[PDB]
Amino acid sequence: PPFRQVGEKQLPHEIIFLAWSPKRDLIALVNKAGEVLLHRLANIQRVWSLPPNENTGKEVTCLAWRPDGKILAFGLADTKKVILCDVEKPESLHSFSLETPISCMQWMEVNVENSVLTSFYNAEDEANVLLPKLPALPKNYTATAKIFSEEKSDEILKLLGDARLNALVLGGDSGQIEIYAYGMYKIATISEVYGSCLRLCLSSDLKSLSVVTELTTNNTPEITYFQLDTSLLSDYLPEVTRMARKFTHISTLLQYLQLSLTCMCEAWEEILMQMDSRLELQTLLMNQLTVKGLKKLGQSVESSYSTIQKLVISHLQSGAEALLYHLSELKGMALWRQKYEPLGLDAKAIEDAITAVGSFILKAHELLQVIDSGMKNFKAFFRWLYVDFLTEHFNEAPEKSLHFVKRQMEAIIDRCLTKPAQIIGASVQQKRCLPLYQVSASEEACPRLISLPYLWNDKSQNLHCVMFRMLESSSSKVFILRQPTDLSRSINEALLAVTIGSSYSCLDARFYDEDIITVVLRDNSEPEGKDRVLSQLSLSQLYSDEETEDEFTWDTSKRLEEQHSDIPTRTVFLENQGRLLENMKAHYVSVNGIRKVACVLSSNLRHVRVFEMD
């Protein structure tokens, strides 16, 4: 009676990751076969299926929904790469390699939109609408993915989302963390934890980065909570936002320049292959090649030259011009020092990079001069065989350091991009480390990324929250640890053990709306034990110091499991005692607060039951 059944489907293969789209009623899931599939809310209809291929990663470990729900990113542990693809088309729009194999993923965006941040968004929105679009790259067989192909609305304006800073944070099996702005610019590489990145959470204010890690040991892994001080990204937020944005533009270009140079080099290889296939003398020439065959070779060489000329006079000229534009502005920012210097922006490094772009466009101009001088001799040769002219006929019978200038250019651009990631990564300190518990024999049954502990941001009160199960201490109790984003702040009820009731045992719990959490429970009745409902977190927090104690009395050098005896116990009550029950063996949920949707995955059976909370 409380919630409405929308669909019920038995998935062919087991599911290792479940996630809802933040803006649409779509659910992304990993199929344990390494395939990622999309499903609609109504009757859980399969939208698409992305097969796992050896070419672009086989083992996919996690997913991430971009706040602007048009782009979906997923990490591959085997090939050590993150591939960003559209939600409508299976095709990948972007890809990048990672230092360590992926463990977990998070795609978040800043909740702060104060004064100068608003002035920046408006400026970037007006910059992109004013600056002329780059010339359309021709549809070539050598051109892979074809993002710059220009068909209706371009994918480059989709890849680069809103000016509002969104970060894609990646976790490793070693504990290494990587933060990618707009899901493409590396802001920080953090290596301050010990286990394998189980859960990741960057705060909306960018003050802290909480992480839950599963440390592998001889008998059973040890679940440990950590909190990192990423406050530099908070203090210099409008600068970090603008800085990363210009780097995503310089990353889009250079790649555009390389792809256009690839199309230019391939068109040159098409002339040399056709020339090699073509080339007493009077009889042999007319027998080897017909008079009709010279005409088809004439157009093929003329069309390839025109495209080569267009690629360097239009694509390369506008490409380098836009590169000179975005770098020149980055220097103007870099010249502040008070701002951008403690962020790692070196004016001299980019100044030298401008000259590198200038030397490249000039060397490309010098390369065209060689092609034009070579084509004028061929023009006199072609017209002579059909019917200044005689001189060019005699003279008739990568290169010119272009590979060197492109490498020197991308070398200085990369030094401009790498310096901030090194110094921002140096600024972040490990301020909190809380060993929780050691995994039980039963917890090793379900996948890492579906089960509890559950890390969430709580953007309303700015609190890093964790809901975990310590089975060795208690079988029916759910533990809730909440720490503020600003570490200097002292929180009231830092840790509690909530007994949920009756409904007794809590299997899975997930954040839904402002103060309420969705919860899957195990009732006293034996036939139908599995039942889902929403719980109000307001009942336990108490927001007042009890006997001048904020539960800071526990030893953070010893596991919290060891000191469970003196933990502050609480008893929470449900909105409906017997809300929605199901004949299936539930155990897990995936929810979306604003879209009022839910996805109940069955324990091991991988049968899914969807319900709308509206």
Residue numbers in the entry: 2 to 280, 309 to 416, 443 to 452, 511 to 614, 628 to 740
List passages from the publication reporting this PDB structure.
The anaphase-promoting complex/cyclosome (APC/C) is a large multimeric cullin-RING E3 ubiquitin ligase that functions to regulate cell cycle transitions by ubiquitinating specific cell cycle regulatory proteins and targeting them for proteolysis by the ubiquitin-proteasome system. Only four subunits are directly involved in catalyzing protein ubiquitination (the cullin subunit Apc2 and the RING subunit Apc11) and degron recognition [coactivator subunits (either Cdc20 or Cdh1) and Apc10]. The remaining 85% of the APC/C mass corresponds to scaffolding subunits, of which seven are large multiple repeat motif proteins (Apc1 and Apc3–Apc8). Seeking to obtain insights into these structures at atomic resolution and to assist in the interpretation of cryo-EM reconstructions of the APC/C complex, we determined the crystal structures of full-length Apc4 and the N-terminal domain of Apc5 (Apc5N).
We first determined the crystal structure of Xenopus laevis Apc4 (residues 1–741 that lacked the C-terminal 48 residues that were predicted to be disordered). The protein was overexpressed in the insect cell/baculovirus system and the structure was determined using phases to 3.2 Å resolution derived from multiwavelength anomalous diffraction. Tracing of the polypeptide chain was guided by selenomethionine anomalous signals. Apc4HBD is inserted between strands C and D of blade 4 of the WD40 domain, extending away from the wider lower surface of the β-propeller such that, together, the HBD and WD40 domain generate an L-shaped molecule. A second smaller insert between β-strands A and B within blade 3 of Apc4WD40 contacts Apc4HBD. Finally, an insert between β-strands C and D of blade 6 forms an edge β-strand (βE5) with β-strand D of blade 5. Apart from these three insertions, Apc4WD40 resembles a canonical β-propeller architecture as judged by its similarity with other WD40 domain proteins (high DALI Z scores). Human and X. laevis Apc4 are also very similar, differing only for residues 120–130 (X. laevis Apc4 numbering) within the shorter WD40 insert that is an α-helix in the X. laevis Apc4 structure in contrast to a predominantly disordered loop structure in human Apc4.
